[PDB]
Design a protein around this nucleic acid. Structure first.
Lengths: 141, 139, 231, 68, 191, 90, 75
RNA sequence: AGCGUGUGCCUACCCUACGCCGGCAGGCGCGGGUAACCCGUUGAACCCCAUUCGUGAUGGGGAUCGGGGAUUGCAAUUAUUCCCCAUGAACGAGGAAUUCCCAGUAAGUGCGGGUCAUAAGCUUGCGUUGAUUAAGUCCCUGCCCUUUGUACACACCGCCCG
RNA sequence: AACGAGACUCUGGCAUGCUAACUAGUUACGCGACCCCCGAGCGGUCGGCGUCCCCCAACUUCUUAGAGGGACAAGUGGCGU
């Protein structure tokens, strides 16, 4: 199936687990000291947040035409509570997303293609739709 | 289950076994919530249970991982103090030493008698703030 | 307040309106219903006509003959009925007595024009006929409670043209549950069975004979007459 | 001797609306038919927005309205 | 059922209005049963137009109040789906008949108002519309659950389903049936 | 608990209350002359003269003498009044 | 404010009652465990997750912010 | 999701994609845009879905305050602005009084423009989510028209008595 | 008779009518390429998913902005001299 058919809350939670089994993703050392965005006030509860976020990275590339380190951050950014000052939007971290996308590219599930952005490899696109049916196999769509 | 112990004393502040581990530790000054969720993970223990469920062997390691943070590879920028000033090093300050350190810097800025110590001694706001409509104790 | 006192040559009279009303009330009982579709059949067919009536131009009706006791070793065995059954779900169905509320003119009897006021003042319309036809309302409800209907259906019908007592038009239908309806209209049958008791207190101690129980045409009182028989 | 014996809950319906009264227009004069007697009618003061033909719930019909 | 919507699971058949007074301003099943309570945003541009829209929707509207909850009608519908669910498990009924009793038992029979005489407060007893009763009864019980959950561990869903029970069977443990009787107790005095 | 021989007050008896809230329509008050049962005072029957201030009359945290005008025995509504009070009763 | 007592882990009487309160109560939410017993409330959340794995309770609805559980779904 | 805006202008200056380096602020290398053409298929917030906390001045609240890192400028001390760690106050629904509002309206929520070398808790516009209550009245406050009375016309805030 | 009110100007709401568009789209194939059998079938094809390919294709519903039309108390029932 196409990844469109299935729920997406389910998609990531099986795709994150998939990667961590296969020895995939060489992770940065900083992963236990990282706020993760400028608009947070705390570190994540999750201890495998890197695996989770790489799932959501590869999915969006399937849909849209692909874009760099800047655009990924804009997709993830949220609201910043400035305390006594009124809240405003802001963008999160960059150097995390710059490690994510290069780690994917090491596995050749993405690659720097033309028109100013990484795009997902046919090998990558194969692997997405492969586990997309595994979701329907599991529960029952 | 797990009836073994509850409220305890650690260095300089009494910490309850009632609360979760990270949030329990924050009561000690010089340690915020952000500082504790790091130090627990360097210690490689759960933060998903109560502070009364820690053993003596475990908490003995906690204070060591806390008070030598550079040697357990917590970055320098993540400390309270970087080059204190006139002491020459990166430092991490905890409960009763924090107050002692703090009182020194007040004394220093009246020693030289900068603008700072005068504002301190007069009991007026240090930073750029209006005091015309701010305060009252008086009226 | 003061009923129509018009003569029998007039449309709006007691007789012609009762003709009008009784003419329509059974016409719509069958218009509710699908005579070209399956009937539920009792093993006993109608005993008021033969089964050589193959037209199916009998009314939709079946006749319960039922048991009651009023005390004093009395055994009432009386005909009761339904007019239509409505498809439910889960193999169940809803028995219905159907009756029909006619109208002739709003403004000659201190009534409500239902066309203007059905949706907004749904309750006021039914309150009209607790002042103008309260006799007929509880009469119909008594029949529905005698039957033990699942839904009490009524039809709103009025004259198509208020000077033409022949042409009429359906305006709406509304299903009520007869027993919660009886809780609403302030009707109770505990009273009712002492009425029929009190009439049987007379006739039983009397001997056989054509005795007449009637209502006086100009006074509010009923009686039991002993007549020379065959009169 | 003790407390009181009171009449049961009555129901009476509008026949016509008359006009609004009170010192901010908050009260409404209305004519109502007793809903058991069709020649009986009382005038009332009713607070809420009313149309015509709707039914009220009177606790007594001893009370009667005038103007103030 | 295939020609008339339920509520997503709850029948609007076997639902009655047990007054003759307050029907034609309580309706829920004539054809007004729908899968969800929502509107396109027509609800009022005439005085009569208010009446038509469902009772279940009216309940959802008056549930979101006091600043932080305004303009969050979807969050509000979450509380209502749990309410009926809790009411059905807890007592076992068609859980709409609960609500209809709860509305009818909370509406006042007589009410007071003000009248100006001598520059001093005097009060006058007056009657109340059926449309007023419905509006008041929906207001009163929604204030109860809002009040209770302001420092309780209990969620608003739990509080609200409790409040419809004690209204549907009068017991004076609700904020509604209390406050109803307060008004009538005044209306007896000055009359 | 109850401070009095009967649990519920009668009709026309002198009692005492302690104000715990001030209402628009009068004063809703707790008893301390009986159980902590609720009793409602009404605005009309507090005085026979004008009233400028309002907190220089009735206010929270005051023992006030009053007369029980009516009681619903079954419901537990103790209607109350401060209109008929004499200093001798106080 | 006020002071209310709570317990973050079980002792004998709480735990033993917890197994026998189930058939006696039709509605079961973590909030109701807060009042009938003196229990934190977060303790009651995970306590009910345990019971569902035994099948001593039944799920009937679930959400992010509120969760309902029932006796055994029998009648 | 929408109204807009953008260097080639004032005298020295714009909006930013993409690549690389850094926890972050930020730095650095390249490219486009005179603009329904490039930024931007403006991949915004509330909302929605799943964990954690548990009635506790609590992890609610973020005032006060210590140390350190960046950016603008000729210069940042009485802290220009921004970021990181630590410190953790009042405040637990508010007296006498009083403001504003009738349908995509009130309220919640974000964004663009304006001032701008650096910088909105302001103002001006725009989208998004979206109720309750009324269909009235002259009671208060005030205004329009007629009639009436006046020692007033600097007009009742007027005028005037012992 | 004149000024103000109204009339007027702008804006919103109604067009599968009109006008015309690679600095705006849609549809249609031509497609070839990628993808998974995910459904009939076998993987092809038919169907589904977006992107590149798109034209000397077709069209202007959506988007854009111009010319026009449409609402007048017009029709019906009450009420008012």
């Amino acid at each position: 199936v196409t990844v469109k058919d299935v729920n997406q809350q389910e998609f990531v939670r099986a795709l994150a687990a998939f990667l961590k089994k296969s020895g995939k993703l060489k992770v940065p050392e900083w992963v236990d000291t990282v706020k993760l965005a400028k608009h947070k006030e705390l570190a994540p509860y999750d201890e495998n947040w890197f695996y989770t976020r790489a799932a959501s990275t590869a999915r969006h590339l399937y849909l849209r035409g692909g874009a760099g380190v800047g655009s990924m951050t804009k997709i993830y950014g949220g609201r910043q509570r400035n305390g006594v000052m009124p809240s405003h939007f802001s963008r999160g971290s960059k150097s995390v997303a710059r490690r994510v996308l290069q780690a994917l590219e090491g596995l050749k599930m993405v690659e720097k293609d033309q028109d100013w952005g990484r795009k997902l490899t046919p090998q990558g696109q194969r692997d997405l739709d492969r586990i997309a049916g595994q979701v329907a196999a599991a529960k029952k769509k | 289950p797990e009836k073994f112990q509850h409220i305890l004393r650690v260095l300089n502040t009494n910490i309850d076994g009632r609360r979760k581990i990270a949030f329990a530790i924050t009561a000690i000054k010089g340690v915020g919530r952000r500082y504790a969720h790091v130090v627990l993970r360097k210690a490689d223990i759960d933060l998903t249970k109560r502070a009364g469920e820690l053993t003596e062997d475990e908490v003995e390691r906690v204070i060591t991982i806390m008070q030598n943070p550079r040697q357990y590879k917590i970055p320098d920028w993540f400390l309270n103090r970087q080059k204190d000033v006139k002491d020459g090093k990166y430092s991490q300050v905890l409960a009763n030493g924090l107050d002692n350190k703090l009182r020194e810097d007040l004394e220093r800025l009246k020693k030289i008698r900068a603008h700072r110590g005068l504002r301190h001694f007069w009991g007026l706001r240090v930073r750029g703030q209006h005091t015309k409509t701010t305060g009252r104790r008086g009226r | 307040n003061e009923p129509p006192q018009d003569e029998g040559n007039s449309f709006n009279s007691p007789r012609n309106l009762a003709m009008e009303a009784t003419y329509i009330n059974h016409n719509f009982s069958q218009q509710c219903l699908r005579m070209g579709k399956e009937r539920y059949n009792f093993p006993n067919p109608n005993p008021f006509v033969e089964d050589d009536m193959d037209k199916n131009e009998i009314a939709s009706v079946a006749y319960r003959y039922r048991r009651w006791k009023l005390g004093d070793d009395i055994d009432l065995i009386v005909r009761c009925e339904h007019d239509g059954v409505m498809t439910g779900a889960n193999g169940e169905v809803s028995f219905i007595n159907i009756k029909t509320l006619n109208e002739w003119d709003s403004r000659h009897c201190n009534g409500v024009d239902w066309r203007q006021k059905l949706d907004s003042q749904r309750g006021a319309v039914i309150a009209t006929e607790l002042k103008n036809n309260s006799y007929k309302l509880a009469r119909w409800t008594c029949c529905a409670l005698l039957a033990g209907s699942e839904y009490l259906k009524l039809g709103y019908v009025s004259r198509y043209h208020v000077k033409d007592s022949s042409r009429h038009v359906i305006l709406g239908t509304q299903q009520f549950k007869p027993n919660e309806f009886a809780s609403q209209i302030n009707l109770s049958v505990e009273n009712a069975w002492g009425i029929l008791r009190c009439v049987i207190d007379i006739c039983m101690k009397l001997e056989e004979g054509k005795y007449l129980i009637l209502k006086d045409p100009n006074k509010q009182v009923i009686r039991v007459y002993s007549l020379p028989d065959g009169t | 001797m003790d407390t009181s014996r009171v009449q049961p809950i009555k129901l009476a319906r509008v026949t016509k609306v008359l006009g609004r009264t009170g010192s901010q227009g908050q009260c409404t004069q209305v004519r109502v038919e007793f809903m058991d007697d069709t020649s009986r009618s009382i005038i009332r003061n009713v607070k809420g927005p009313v149309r015509e033909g709707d039914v009220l719930t009177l606790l007594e019909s001893e009370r009667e309205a005038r103007r103030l | 059922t295939p020609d008339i919507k339920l509520f997503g699971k709850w029948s609007t058949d076997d639902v009655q209005i047990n007054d003759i007074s307050l029907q034609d301003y309580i309706a829920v099943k004539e054809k007004y049963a729908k899968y969800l309570p929502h509107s396109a945003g027509r609800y009022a541009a005439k005085r009569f137009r208010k009446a038509q829209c469902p009772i279940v929707e009216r309940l959802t509207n008056s549930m979101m109040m006091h600043g932080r909850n305004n303009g969050k009608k979807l969050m509000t519908v979450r509380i209502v789906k749990h309410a009926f669910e809790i009411i059905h498990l807890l007592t076992g009924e068609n859980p709409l008949q609960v609500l209809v009793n709860a509305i009818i038992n909370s509406g006042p029979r007589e009410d007071s108002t003000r009248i100006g005489r001598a520059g001093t407060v005097r009060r006058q007893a007056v009657d109340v519309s059926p449309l007023r009763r419905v509006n008041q009864a929906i207001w009163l019980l929604c204030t109860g659950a809002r009040e209770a959950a302001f420092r309780n561990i209990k969620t608003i869903a739990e509080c609200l389903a409790d409040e419809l029970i004690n209204a549907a069977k009068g017991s004076s443990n609700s904020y509604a049936i209390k406050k109803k009787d307060e008004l009538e107790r005044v209306a007896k005095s000055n009359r | 608990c109850r401070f009095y021989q009967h649990k519920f007050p009668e009709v026309e008896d002198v009692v005492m209350v302690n104000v715990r809230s001030i209402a628009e329509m009068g004063a809703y008050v707790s008893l301390l002359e009986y159980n902590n049962i609720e009793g409602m005072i009404l605005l009309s029957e507090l005085s026979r003269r004008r009233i400028r201030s309002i907190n220089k009359l009735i206010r929270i945290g005051r023992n006030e003498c009053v007369v029980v005008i009516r009681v619903d025995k079954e419901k537990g509504y103790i209607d109350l009044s401060k209109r008929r009070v004499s200093p001798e009763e106080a | 404010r006020d002071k209310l007592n709570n317990l973050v882990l079980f002792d004998k009487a709480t735990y033993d009652k917890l197994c026998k309160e189930v058939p006696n109560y039709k509605l079961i939410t973590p909030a109701v465990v807060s009042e009938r017993l003196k229990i934190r409330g977060s303790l009651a959340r995970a306590a009910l997750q345990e019971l569902l794995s035994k099948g001593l309770i039944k799920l009937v609805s679930k959400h992010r912010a509120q969760v309902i559980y029932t006796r055994n779904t029998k009648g």
